[PDB]
Design a protein around this ligand. Structure first.
Ligand SMILES: CC(=O)c1ccc(O)cc1
Length: 115
């Protein structure tokens, strides 16, 4: 509260660490469904069903241009990619499995790096 400060985590390396994790995700062999925005004019149903589209190249642009206030907002966008994927794809489709694999990969890196 006012003039009563909680001890705060050192956040000075967060930008660099999130960039490193994003690089690891960008180069994973199962990243291919997520590298670019879904083409809303070629993919039936996507525009209407998925209210907040997100993809790795959009996350990279936002990280490079100071649009994440903190590391939690970055993780929210990464998780949005995989949440969208589950909404639109069967668990045992190629894209569906790819999403489950990539979420598992991300969450371990996140835990190992920050938690
Ligand atoms: C990411 C995703 O759900 C998706 C769906 C259909 C595509 O043709 C490409 C990507």
């Amino acid at each position: 509260s006012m003039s009563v400060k909680k001890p705060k985590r050192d956040d000075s390396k967060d930008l660099a660490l999130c960039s490193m994790i994003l690089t690891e995700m960008e180069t994973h062999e199962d990243a291919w469904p997520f590298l670019l925005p879904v083409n809303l004019k070629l993919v039936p149903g996507y525009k209407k069903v998925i209210k907040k589209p997100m993809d790795f190249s959009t996350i990279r642009e936002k990280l490079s241009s100071g649009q994440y206030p903190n590391l939690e907002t970055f993780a929210l966008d990464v998780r949005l990619v995989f949440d969208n994927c589950e909404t639109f794809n069967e668990d045992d489709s190629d894209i569906g499995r790819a999403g489950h694999n990539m979420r598992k990969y991300f969450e371990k890196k996140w835990t190992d790096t920050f938690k």
